[PDB]
Design a protein around this ligand. Structure first.
Ligand code: SAH
Ligand code: SAH
Lengths: 388, 388
């Protein structure tokens, strides 16, 4: 059935945050509908495109319900899908994070029997973790829209990370943003954290000329006229925990961990107790570094030019991927530079075989010993945090 | 000071999730340290690089404490920074989401007086929103590590979206993952949601050959051996809201939102109440679409080639960006194809002026009328969800 919908993101920073798969799609799509934040990104999308594009932000108006705009945004995309075009929608950031028309359009398209897919993009929260230098895993991390939090009369949990989005549009359902209802959010913060607790006002840099906003304010300061001025439709708040929960010695014991575990994963922001970088355990790990030899030989990458070229192709060329998926043995036959082993692996169209052929022990490489057909066919994640 | 540290991500999907700014850095960096999850991504990094690289995953071992490995990963990067090198670190996904050695290395580099920066990447949660088709904003969304949730004796809130990471490594501090403590997570889920509530087991597709895992299980099912065994170190759980909180009519009033609005921003997954795609409100919006005319004239993109060329350069070339920030007036003067207005705006090194010169009203464009020096000098976001 002709016609498809792909919805992707542009990320937050101008141009730089765009993913490789997304740039590829921009170049090939029949038509692009976009809602982005800065003119350099907008121009970049247009100029890389096939030249058939539409600015979704043209459906906004000062006193018009945003919900009405969103329905219309979804609809113009669906019309072109119905017309049998390959439609790309692009929203700034991640197209599925605090975005109504994307999920709406995908669901309707699928219901009408078209293929539809969302691609992830770089969100404002992703930008925040990088710029503010915290990890959501350290205490756990709650994401909420400011108006959503208030309309459902939710409380904020002061023991975890909190991120509050759209703080500049509390209670606003049109396009007039005057901060008239901001005080309601301040009242919530006061109740949950008190007046002395500090929050972080975050605006990630959109242009090269932008500088990151990461100002700290005590909750009591959020009433000052000069502070209030700074909160825009772009503003996000980070609220660090006031009262991180203590380790439960009973749970530690039940998990089979050492009782001498006094610590969780380190937070480096300076909002909590800042433990020295090179304590005894760190000193010991550093001292052991040069000497460390793994218990078993580790594999290294070992792939033909043909294998690597194909694997890049499948990542970046959706037309080639569709053909490979339809008929992998036929597809792999196309690429005669492939070793026997690689051709066999690709035919199976399974992930495990790929790892066996593209990664080999140095010992086996030196010997010239290749993986057996059996080793290939039978086959099948680095954890980079420990809360303990 | 000679020596810098930049830490970036590779995203989750092989190659396609890498950001444009990250590829640029791979090409230019003196030295790359990486921890990635697939050999195509690994090869791609190597082949785009200047050929000085190091596999951080060399520091793991079966019965070695992961924390020791992480200290060592940070340290090898810091050694090269201290040596005066421009170092790039790359971790799969987002390098600051559930990653200990990145935030550590950045903090230490900064404290020692070196320039250090984290760039965002596509996280597993980013992948999940796109794949599972939900928006964290609709009910709020809590992110947590499985072991952390247990060791701090946290309760899960059944009124919001919940995402639980590292479910396949409960209580494990080394590199042996047997799921021997996974039952502890099941007990927690049982207490908070009961036995009949359904969760989704998510594994985003890493290779072209991978297929997305998005299986639904009742909490009851999680104790079965053939189910339990499916949960690997790559697994994440999505736990949809069981009892979403009602829209409080009094909060609706206080917020200045339309009365008796009962309908919060729509979730399309199927886990929440079925709701017509084309109810009367949506139909009215669709009918109004074709004749919609905005109340005032909207600006459009309007910039010289020189402006667009420079703005792309600044997004993708850190060397040029540094020179620009050092002397913006002198830098702008070197691009003689800029309009006089563009040269002035750029020389201010402020974001507001850029918007003034790069977006102009069609009426003014037709006149050749440009923004004034005064308009540019005094210069100072599309919201894409509304929770009702
Ligand atoms: N540059 C920026 N810095 C900080 N927060 C930002 C931001 N741009 C957008 N946001 C956040 O996103 C809200 C708009 S909703 C759209 C978010 C976008 N889809 C994303 O993935 O990030 C803003 O009100 C704010 O809370
Ligand atoms: N392909 C994948 N699908 C789903 N979850 C994944 C995943 N890869 C990693 N994860 C999640 O991430 C955990 C590893 S911690 C590292 C996460 C990475 N920095 C990121 O930004 O996503 C896993 O235990 C799992 O919960």
């Amino acid at each position: 059935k002709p016609g498809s919908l792909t919805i992707a993101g542009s990320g937050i920073a101008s141009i730089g945050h765009i993913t490789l798969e997304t740039l590829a799609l921009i170049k090939e799509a029949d038509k692009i509908f976009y809602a982005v934040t800065d003119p350099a990104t907008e121009c970049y999308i247009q100029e890389n495109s096939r030249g058939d594009h539409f600015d979704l932000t043209t459906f906004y108006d000062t006193n018009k319900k945003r919900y009405e705009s969103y329905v219309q945004m979804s609809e113009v995309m669906l019309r072109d899908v119905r017309a049998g075009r390959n439609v790309l929608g692009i929203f700034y950031g991640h197209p599925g994070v605090f975005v109504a028309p994307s999920h709406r359009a995908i669901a309707i398209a699928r219901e009408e029997g078209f293929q539809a897919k969302m691609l992830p993009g770089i969100s404002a929260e992703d930008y925040m973790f990088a710029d503010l230098g915290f990890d959501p895993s350290t205490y756990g991390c709650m994401t909420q829209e400011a108006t959503e939090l208030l309309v459902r009369n939710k409380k904020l949990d002061p023991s975890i990370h909190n991120i509050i989005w759209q703080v500049g549009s509390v209670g606003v359902d049109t396009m007039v943003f005057d901060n008239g209802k901001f005080h309601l959010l301040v009242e919530r913060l006061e109740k949950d954290f008190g007046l002395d607790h500090k929050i972080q006002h975050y605006i990630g840099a959109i242009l090269p000329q932008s500088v990151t906003v990461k100002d700290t304010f005590a909750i009591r300061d959020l009433r000052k006229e000069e502070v209030l001025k700074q909160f825009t439709t772009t503003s996000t708040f980070y609220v660090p925990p006031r009262t991180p929960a203590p380790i439960d010695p009973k749970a530690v014991q039940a998990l089979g961990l050492p009782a001498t575990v006094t610590k969780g994963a380190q937070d480096w922001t300076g909002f909590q107790s800042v433990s020295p970088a090179y304590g005894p355990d760190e000193m010991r790990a550093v001292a052991a570094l040069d000497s460390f030899v793994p218990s078993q030989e580790k594999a290294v990458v070992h792939a033909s030019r043909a294998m690597q070229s194909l694997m890049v192709d499948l990542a970046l060329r959706p037309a080639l991927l569709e053909q490979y998926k339809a008929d992998p043995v036929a597809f792999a036959n196309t690429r005669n530079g492939l070793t026997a082993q690689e051709k066999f692996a690709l035919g199976l169209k399974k992930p495990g075989p790929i790892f066996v052929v593209m990664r080999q022990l140095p010992s086996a490489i030196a010997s010239g010993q290749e993986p057996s057909q059996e080793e290939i066919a039978r086959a099948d994640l680095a954890l980079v945090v420990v809360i303990v």
